Design a binder for this molecule. Structure first.
Ligand SMILES: [Mg+2]
Lengths: 223, 57, 98, 123, 114, 93, 97, 223
RNA sequence: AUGUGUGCU
């Protein structure tokens, strides 16, 4: 027959999509490829590497700044930016602040067509005489790439940062059983998606389906 | 038995429950009440966790 | 091989010879002594328990058989071997909860 | 008459007919109400042989009071269904739980799938 | 816990953080190795979000049994992605995230008793 | 699990009290028309084919979901034996 | 294996992953070539298997092989009961028939 | 960086397909979902019911016939009967012969737009005076259809046969690598398909692709 | 309707 697609969205991050009824087996058949696509294909961005002034190693501690360097570096990974035009491929955010102020992700001086979809993300609390002058790289990767795989040495002694590109935080799916009067062994696809807010779940799903279709068009010109 | 009858049959239970009885009934937890799910096949399907209760393999 | 024969499951040959007529109801045997003794091949005889006993031929017309060699299979034999089931490619592993 | 569509012989059902739980196997009456022999709630199947021991019986016993007996061999072929009992020679009993289709079954790098999956926790 | 590989200390060596780490990248000591106090899997891989650690697992970089560093409710935790996944399971099972991390135990594997 | 049973068990002195309450509630809810319910406008039990649980699929489900709100009160003796039976059949079809 | 290595196919990425995990497991010997690792595994009755409903190889080699399994005399159709209300008896009102 | 598609169709029973390159693990993301549809769906052709000359029930025998009725019919399942046009929905093949000869499947009376790809198939050995006069009805369906379901009564004593519709017999995929000297981690998909002949592996592959595509379209309108 | 026997749990 024809399966209906029902959405239960909760804002901009979480959505639960249910497509039913499905022919036997097609539940995982459809649900599983998308899950792979979602966690590794959707184009987002991330912090690839960061340079700080009085910081040499990744495992250092800067007095005046309470939070250890690694802790800050985590929070750098926790932010999500968005590029207005496709032209922007690699952009560098600049940051500078001193004293008993704290730095949030909105303090990064806005560079051209760069939007910060998450401003109040705590970057670092600073004490008296706490000087902090850092800079951050932003590339347009696709998925997750450990720091010790790229480590973009933008400056001379910058620090590699694990690049968490994939907009989806996580994607989980299940195939329950549904009936159609005659038969009860009909697959029921329930697919839940968790994002960082860069893109709503439905948009991401749209992305997945498109990506799969374009791939299905590759089996057309034999040689 | 057409679709109508089956759909009706789902409308006749909903919250209703049935009692499932073990071969040798020993202790209190030897008979439980479960909500019936219209499953194909011909054997009674029983939940994993309630086995060791009335000792069923 | 011993079980099927000793249990009188299948039918064997009594004396050397060639094959006359392989039907699904009979197997006629060419004894050298100018004799062909009639063999029934019984298809659907209800067991005392409920199962079905079938004797099916295992030699083709125009073949020389020997004394004590099989001509048909029993309800649970395959070419003379006790056939009590199936040989299935099994993977031993836990699978969901099934 | 629709229930008699299989009744071929004058009293005996045809051989090779399909009988189902409630189908009429034998036709006979007593003191006139129907007291015939129908197929039990279980299952019939396909008739293979119909034995009938009459009164003019060339040397039989036959139960006292009874004039004639009508026995029907209803055969049927049963496939392996969820719930059947399977075991080996080493001694692992086990009822069939699910019959997964070929596609969602653990398979080798070769195109060849597995037939049966046996829990290691039973060992 | 695998072969010690090369050198087993970091109970205090100030250099051992930036140094021994590179060792694993060389060939010296494997990932979840009892390299004392920590292990390269804890230094190399620090995951910001508790969720993100599990996202990394789906990219075959760290197994659900490799000891790494995560951050549940805002603090550094020495544990494996699988364990934090167990924590998350119990959490979202009963909707109460607070007691979920309190009721379980994240220092030993899960058995009948646990 | 069931509609918030922990609230229900705590709601009464003995666990059996709840059972009798629910049962009798279902009974009168079925015998005197399913209209004498105490939560029929928007906050009400529904089903899956149509939303037609609004009428009469299950009796107990209703009783349990009703008791969940302070709309009903149980107890030993509250109303005379016959009078209750009479007026409960009068006020409704 | 000779069939594959000969036909024009080699060590699948999935096989390689499973081997990598098998090293940590303790079955295969650290050092050999993926082919020899697979040999060591095959010797132990174990072989790389794919989930089938995903494609993801089951992380950890499992012993596979054909065994002899027999369908016992019990069935389910031989034992199936489901009556709500039917015949009773003239001598005893307890339901059976 | 555009995926190349190579075909290696050896005959009509076997078929091999190559796709290279794919970005990251996208081989498995395509390999499995197709294998599922290739084994599950796809229109096939099998024998539905058969009527023998004097045979009434499935549990019989025939004078001059080594194989009992069940065994004979059991062979008809291993038969492949390739049609030509979609119009052919119910082709009732006929077969009758006598004399000492192995009745191969190449003896069926030929029909207008129908071909038997499986000629050598053993039906029954005929004995001195053995003679069989049978009508083998062939239908077109999909997937596994147990005979105890349809029960197609062609004649009157016709005995229904398990319909096993699935031209695709076996499928397996392999994921290699190489190509593009820049990024190392890449995928190379190689999908091997074995079909019974009624449908060439290429045709099956294309059909499966169409199926998957149609299923992808379903995620359109939410509710 | 009771006994004998076997099968499984
Ligand atoms: Mg038991």
């Amino acid at each position: 027959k024809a399966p209906v697609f029902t959405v239960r969205t909760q804002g901009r991050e979480y959505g639960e999509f249910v497509l039913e009824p499905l022919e036997r087996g097609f539940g995982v058949t459809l649900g599983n490829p998308l899950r792979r696509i979602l966690l590794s294909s959707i184009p987002g961005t991330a912090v690839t590497s960061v340079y700080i002034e009085d910081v040499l190693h990744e495992f250092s501690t800067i007095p005046g700044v309470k939070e250890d360097v690694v802790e800050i570096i985590l929070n750098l990974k926790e932010l999500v930016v968005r590029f207005l035009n496709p032209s922007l491929q690699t952009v560098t955010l600049l940051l500078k602040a001193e004293g008993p102020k704290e730095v949030k992700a909105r303090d990064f001086l806005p560079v051209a067509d760069v939007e910060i979809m998450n401003p109040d993300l705590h970057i670092a609390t600073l004490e008296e005489g706490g000087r902090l002058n850092m800079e951050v790289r932003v590339d347009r990767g696709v998925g997750y790439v450990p720091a010790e795989k790229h480590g973009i040495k933008d400056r001379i002694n910058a620090i590699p940062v694990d690049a968490v590109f994939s907009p989806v935080r996580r994607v989980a799916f299940q195939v329950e059983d549904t009936r159609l009067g005659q038969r009860t062994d009909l697959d029921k696809l329930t697919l839940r998606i968790w994002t960082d807010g860069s893109v709503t779940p439905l948009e991401a799903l749209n992305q997945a389906v498109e990506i799969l279709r374009e791939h299905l068009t590759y089996f057309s010109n034999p040689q | 038995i057409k679709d109508e009858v089956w759909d009706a049959l789902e409308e006749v239970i909903h919250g209703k429950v049935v009692l499932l009885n073990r071969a040798p009934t020993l202790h209190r937890l030897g008979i439980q009440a479960f909500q019936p799910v219209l499953v194909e096949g011909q054997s009674i399907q029983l939940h994993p966790l309630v086995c060791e209760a009335f000792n069923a393999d | 091989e011993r079980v099927v024969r000793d249990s009188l499951a299948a039918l064997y040959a009594e004396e050397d010879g060639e094959v006359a007529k392989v039907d699904g109801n009979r197997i006629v045997v060419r004894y050298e002594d100018g004799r062909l003794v009639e063999y029934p091949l019984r298809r659907f005889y209800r067991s005392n328990q409920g199962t079905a006993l079938d004797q099916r031929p295992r030699v083709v017309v125009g073949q020389r058989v020997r004394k004590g060699d099989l001509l048909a299979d029993g309800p649970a034999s395959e070419n003379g071997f006790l056939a009590l089931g199936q040989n299935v490619l099994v993977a031993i592993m836990p699978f969901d909860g099934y | 008459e629709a229930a008699l569509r299989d009744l071929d012989e004058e009293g005996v059902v045809r051989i090779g007919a399909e009988v189902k739980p409630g189908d009429i196997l034998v036709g006979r009456t007593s003191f006139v109400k129907d007291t015939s022999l129908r197929v039990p709630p279980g299952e019939g199947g396909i008739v293979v042989r119909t034995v009938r021991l009459r009164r003019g019986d060339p040397g039989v016993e036959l139960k006292p009071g009874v004039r004639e007996v009508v026995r029907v061999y209803v055969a049927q072929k049963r496939k392996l269904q969820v719930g059947d009992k399977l075991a080996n020679r080493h001694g692992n009993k086990g009822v069939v739980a699910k019959i997964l289709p070929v596609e969602d079954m653990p398979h080798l790098p070769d195109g060849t799938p597995v037939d049966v999956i046996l829990n290691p926790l039973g060992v | 816990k695998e072969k010690k590989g090369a050198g087993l200390e970091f109970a205090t060596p100030e250099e051992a953080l930036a140094a021994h780490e590179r060792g694993e990248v060389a060939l010296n000591a494997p990932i979840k190795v009892a390299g004392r106090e920590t292990s390269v899997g804890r230094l190399k891989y620090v995951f910001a979000n508790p969720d993100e650690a599990l996202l990394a697992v789906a990219h075959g970089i760290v197994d659900l049994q490799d000891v790494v560093t995560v951050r549940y409710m805002g603090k550094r935790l020495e544990t494996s992605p699988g364990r934090i996944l167990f924590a998350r399971i119990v959490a979202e099972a009963v909707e109460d995230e607070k007691v979920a991390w309190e009721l379980i135990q994240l220092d030993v594997p899960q058995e009948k008793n646990s | 699990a069931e509609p918030g049973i922990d609230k229900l068990f705590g709601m009464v002195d003995s666990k059996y009290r709840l059972t009798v309450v629910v049962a009798k509630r279902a009974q009168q809810l079925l015998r005197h028309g399913f209209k004498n319910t105490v939560l029929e406008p928007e906050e009400r039990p529904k089903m899956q084919t149509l939303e037609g649980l609004f009428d009469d699929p299950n009796a107990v489900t209703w009783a349990m979901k009703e008791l969940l709100t302070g709309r009903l009160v149980f107890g030993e003796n509250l109303v005379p034996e016959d009078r209750l039976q009479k007026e409960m059949e009068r006020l409704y079809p | 294996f000779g069939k594959r290595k000969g036909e024009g196919f080699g060590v699948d990425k999935r096989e390689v992953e499973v081997l990598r995990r098998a090293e940590k497991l303790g079955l295969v010997t650290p050092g050999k070539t993926p082919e020899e690792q697979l040999k060591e595994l095959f010797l132990q009755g174990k072989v790389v298997l794919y989930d089938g409903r995903t494609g993801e190889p089951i992380e950890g080699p499992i012993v596979v092989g054909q065994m002899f399994i027999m369908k016992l005399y019990h069935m389910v159709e031989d034992k199936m009961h489901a009556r709500s209300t039917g015949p009773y008896s003239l001598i005893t009102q307890q339901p059976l028939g």
